Design an enzyme around this catalytic site. Structure first.
Site, PDB file in Angstrom:
ATOM      1  N   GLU A  11       0.792  -1.225   0.000  1.00  0.00           N
ATOM      2  CA  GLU A  11       0.000   0.000   0.000  1.00  0.00           C
ATOM      3  C   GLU A  11       0.826   1.277   0.000  1.00  0.00           C
ATOM      4  OE1 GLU A  11      -3.224   0.024  -0.376  1.00  0.00           O
ATOM      5  OE2 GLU A  11      -3.637  -2.109  -0.031  1.00  0.00           O
ATOM      6  N   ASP A  20      -6.694   6.019  -4.932  1.00  0.00           N
ATOM      7  CA  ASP A  20      -6.239   4.641  -5.071  1.00  0.00           C
ATOM      8  C   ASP A  20      -6.286   4.215  -6.538  1.00  0.00           C
ATOM      9  OD1 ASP A  20      -8.890   3.878  -5.587  1.00  0.00           O
ATOM     10  OD2 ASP A  20      -9.118   2.743  -3.733  1.00  0.00           O
TER      11      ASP A  20
END
Ligand SMILES: Fc1ccc(Br)cc1
Length: 162
Positions: A11, A20
């Site tokens: 991440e 994202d």
């Protein structure tokens, strides 16, 4: 290696609101804020999550605290889910990390993986790996999915040491 190090690799860490891979407002170590296109809505979610007026920016300590909460929420969701818990409990610790990783990324999104889950519970690792790749998940985030799948296939951290 442990679930925190694994997801931190997958991440990254960003201290200001970002988007994202799906275009959704996110912050920290992959903390989804909202699927709404409104940046103001994302900022409101952030302030609620942190407990102060953040203006879209957090500290590393705050990002790590949110991350701990998010990992715990993924685990407790697996344990409350009658489909997921028996499979999770059948796995060794390294493969349990791969399971948490998937739930962190897609949420209890994993509902379409019934056949993969069965192969995992049967410990048919190569077959599970083939089946897991036949997915929107693999096609949209192939490098991350390949690492997670290799973890399920081998029960080692080789994809994250490499
Ligand atoms: F409990 C589990 C959750 C997700 C996967 Br993938 C496997 C087991």
């Amino acid at each position: 290696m442990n679930i925190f190090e694994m997801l931190r690799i997958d991440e990254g860490l960003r201290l200001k609101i970002y988007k994202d891979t799906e275009g959704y407002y996110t912050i920290g170590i992959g903390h989804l804020l909202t699927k709404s296109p409104s940046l103001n809505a994302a900022k409101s979610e952030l302030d609620k999550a942190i407990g102060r007026n953040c203006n879209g920016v957090i500290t590393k300590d705050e990002a790590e605290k949110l991350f701990n909460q998010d990992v715990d929420a993924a685990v407790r969701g697996i344990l409350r889910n009658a489909k997921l818990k028996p499979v999770y409990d059948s796995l060794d610790a390294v493969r349990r990390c791969a399971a948490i990783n998937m739930v962190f990324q897609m949420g209890e999104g994993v509902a379409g993986f019934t056949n993969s889950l069965r192969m995992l519970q049967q410990k048919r690792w190569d077959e599970a790996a083939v089946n897991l790749a036949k997915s929107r998940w693999y096609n949209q985030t192939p490098n991350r999915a390949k690492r997670v799948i290799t973890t399920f296939r081998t029960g080692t951290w080789d994809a994250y040491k490499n």
